[PDB]
Design a protein around this nucleic acid. Structure first.
Ligand SMILES: [Ca+2]
Ligand SMILES: [Ca+2]
Length: 78
DNA sequence: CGTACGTGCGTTTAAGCGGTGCTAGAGCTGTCTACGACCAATTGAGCGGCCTCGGCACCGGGATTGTGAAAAAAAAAAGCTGCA
Protein backbone atom coordinates (compact mmCIF):
# COMPACT_ATOMS: atom_id res chain seq x y z
CA UNK A 1 0.00 0.00 0.00
CA UNK A 2 2.78 2.48 -1.15
CA UNK A 3 3.83 4.82 -4.09
CA UNK A 4 5.43 3.32 -7.27
CA UNK A 5 3.10 2.58 -10.27
CA UNK A 6 3.15 3.07 -14.08
CA UNK A 7 3.53 1.39 -17.56
CA UNK A 8 3.91 -1.99 -19.49
CA UNK A 9 6.90 -0.37 -21.36
CA UNK A 10 7.09 -0.99 -25.32
CA UNK A 11 4.72 -0.67 -28.48
CA UNK A 12 1.88 -2.25 -26.51
CA UNK A 13 2.51 0.91 -24.34
CA UNK A 14 3.53 3.54 -26.96
CA UNK A 15 0.06 2.70 -28.33
CA UNK A 16 -1.45 2.45 -24.75
CA UNK A 17 0.02 5.74 -23.18
CA UNK A 18 -0.71 7.72 -26.39
CA UNK A 19 -4.28 6.35 -25.93
CA UNK A 20 -4.19 6.54 -22.08
CA UNK A 21 -3.65 10.29 -22.46
CA UNK A 22 -7.32 11.32 -22.96
CA UNK A 23 -6.35 13.65 -25.92
CA UNK A 24 -3.48 14.25 -28.49
CA UNK A 25 0.06 15.49 -27.54
CA UNK A 26 3.76 16.21 -28.36
CA UNK A 27 7.37 14.82 -28.27
CA UNK A 28 9.65 12.20 -26.67
CA UNK A 29 9.26 14.24 -23.39
CA UNK A 30 5.51 13.46 -22.88
CA UNK A 31 5.75 9.71 -23.64
CA UNK A 32 8.98 8.85 -21.70
CA UNK A 33 8.03 10.37 -18.30
CA UNK A 34 4.66 8.49 -18.45
CA UNK A 35 6.80 5.37 -19.18
CA UNK A 36 9.43 6.07 -16.42
CA UNK A 37 7.14 7.43 -13.61
CA UNK A 38 7.38 4.22 -11.47
CA UNK A 39 11.01 4.85 -10.39
CA UNK A 40 13.22 3.56 -13.27
CA UNK A 41 15.01 6.89 -13.93
CA UNK A 42 16.20 7.06 -17.57
CA UNK A 43 19.84 5.92 -18.29
CA UNK A 44 20.54 3.98 -21.58
CA UNK A 45 16.92 3.44 -22.57
CA UNK A 46 17.26 7.07 -24.02
CA UNK A 47 18.25 5.65 -27.50
CA UNK A 48 15.69 2.81 -27.10
CA UNK A 49 12.64 5.09 -26.56
CA UNK A 50 14.03 7.35 -29.32
CA UNK A 51 14.12 4.54 -31.93
CA UNK A 52 10.35 3.74 -31.57
CA UNK A 53 9.29 6.56 -34.02
CA UNK A 54 10.26 5.04 -37.45
CA UNK A 55 9.22 1.63 -35.95
CA UNK A 56 5.65 2.97 -35.41
CA UNK A 57 4.98 4.32 -39.02
CA UNK A 58 6.91 1.40 -40.71
CA UNK A 59 4.74 -1.12 -38.69
CA UNK A 60 1.73 1.37 -38.90
CA UNK A 61 0.95 2.08 -35.17
CA UNK A 62 0.88 5.89 -34.59
CA UNK A 63 0.43 8.54 -37.30
CA UNK A 64 2.34 11.71 -36.32
CA UNK A 65 0.18 14.91 -36.65
CA UNK A 66 3.05 17.37 -35.78
CA UNK A 67 6.85 17.16 -35.34
CA UNK A 68 10.10 17.23 -37.37
CA UNK A 69 13.55 16.49 -35.76
CA UNK A 70 12.88 13.78 -33.13
CA UNK A 71 9.58 15.50 -32.30
CA UNK A 72 6.29 13.74 -33.01
CA UNK A 73 2.74 14.68 -31.98
CA UNK A 74 1.31 11.18 -32.26
CA UNK A 75 -2.29 10.27 -33.01
CA UNK A 76 -4.50 7.21 -32.85
CA UNK A 77 -8.28 7.13 -33.73
CA UNK A 78 -10.31 10.34 -33.09
C1' DC B 1 15.31 -20.17 -50.41
C1' DG B 2 14.67 -25.43 -51.00
C1' DT B 3 13.12 -28.96 -53.84
C1' DA B 4 9.22 -30.61 -56.51
C1' DC B 5 8.79 -31.41 -60.99
C1' DG B 6 10.33 -31.82 -66.08
C1' DT B 7 13.48 -33.74 -69.22
C1' DG B 8 16.05 -37.17 -71.19
C1' DC B 9 18.25 -41.45 -71.19
C1' DG B 10 18.51 -46.85 -70.98
C1' DT B 11 15.59 -51.00 -69.35
C1' DT B 12 11.36 -53.50 -68.77
C1' DT B 13 6.67 -54.56 -69.64
C1' DA B 14 2.37 -55.72 -71.55
C1' DA B 15 -0.78 -53.52 -75.06
C1' DG B 16 -1.88 -54.25 -79.37
C1' DC B 17 -2.35 -57.03 -83.10
C1' DG B 18 -4.02 -60.89 -85.75
C1' DG B 19 -5.90 -65.43 -85.57
C1' DT B 20 -8.49 -69.40 -83.97
C1' DG B 21 -12.11 -71.94 -81.23
C1' DC B 22 -16.11 -72.12 -78.08
C1' DT B 23 -20.74 -71.13 -76.78
C1' DA B 24 -23.50 -67.77 -73.62
C1' DG B 25 -27.06 -65.38 -74.42
C1' DA B 26 -29.06 -61.74 -77.47
C1' DG B 27 -32.82 -61.48 -79.97
C1' DC B 28 -36.16 -63.32 -83.15
C1' DT B 29 -40.98 -65.87 -84.05
C1' DG B 30 -45.21 -67.85 -82.92
C1' DT B 31 -49.20 -68.85 -79.45
C1' DC B 32 -52.18 -67.79 -76.02
C1' DT B 33 -54.75 -65.28 -72.07
C1' DA B 34 -54.17 -62.35 -68.02
C1' DC B 35 -54.59 -57.81 -67.73
C1' DG B 36 -55.84 -53.10 -68.58
C1' DA B 37 -58.74 -50.05 -71.52
C1' DC B 38 -63.32 -48.76 -71.90
C1' DC B 39 -68.09 -48.32 -70.36
C1' DA B 40 -72.15 -46.91 -67.51
C1' DA B 41 -74.17 -46.41 -63.02
C1' DT B 42 -73.24 -45.45 -58.32
C1' DT B 43 -71.71 -42.57 -54.23
C1' DG B 44 -68.36 -40.87 -51.09
C1' DA B 45 -63.90 -38.48 -50.79
C1' DG B 46 -62.23 -34.07 -51.20
C1' DC B 47 -63.45 -29.70 -52.90
C1' DG B 48 -64.69 -24.48 -51.72
C1' DG B 49 -66.55 -21.96 -48.36
C1' DC B 50 -66.88 -20.28 -43.76
C1' DC B 51 -66.08 -19.55 -38.86
C1' DT B 52 -62.87 -19.54 -34.36
C1' DC B 53 -59.38 -19.15 -31.26
C1' DG B 54 -54.40 -20.24 -30.00
C1' DG B 55 -49.77 -19.83 -32.11
C1' DC B 56 -46.75 -16.71 -33.08
C1' DA B 57 -45.17 -12.04 -34.42
C1' DC B 58 -43.99 -8.08 -32.20
C1' DC B 59 -43.03 -5.47 -28.21
C1' DG B 60 -40.46 -3.89 -23.88
C1' DG B 61 -37.30 -4.74 -20.39
C1' DG B 62 -34.07 -7.49 -18.16
C1' DA B 63 -29.94 -11.02 -18.17
C1' DT B 64 -26.18 -12.54 -20.74
C1' DT B 65 -22.73 -12.62 -24.14
C1' DG B 66 -18.75 -11.08 -26.55
C1' DT B 67 -15.52 -7.62 -28.10
C1' DG B 68 -11.80 -4.24 -27.39
C1' DA B 69 -8.86 -0.99 -25.03
C1' DA B 70 -6.03 -0.37 -21.17
C1' DA B 71 -3.53 -1.75 -17.35
C1' DA B 72 -1.29 -5.06 -14.96
C1' DA B 73 1.62 -9.08 -14.76
C1' DA B 74 4.39 -13.25 -16.39
C1' DA B 75 8.00 -14.33 -19.71
C1' DA B 76 11.21 -14.20 -22.98
C1' DA B 77 15.59 -10.93 -26.26
C1' DA B 78 19.10 -7.09 -25.12
C1' DG B 79 22.47 -5.65 -22.15
C1' DC B 80 26.47 -6.70 -18.70
C1' DT B 81 29.50 -9.74 -14.41
C1' DG B 82 33.31 -11.40 -12.51
C1' DC B 83 35.02 -16.95 -12.76
C1' DA B 84 37.52 -20.15 -14.42
CA1 LIG C 1 -45.13 -60.79 -81.01
CA1 LIG D 1 -60.44 -26.21 -45.99
Amino acid sequence: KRKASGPPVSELITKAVAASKERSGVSLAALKKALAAAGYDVEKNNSRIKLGLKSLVSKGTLVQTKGTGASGSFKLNK
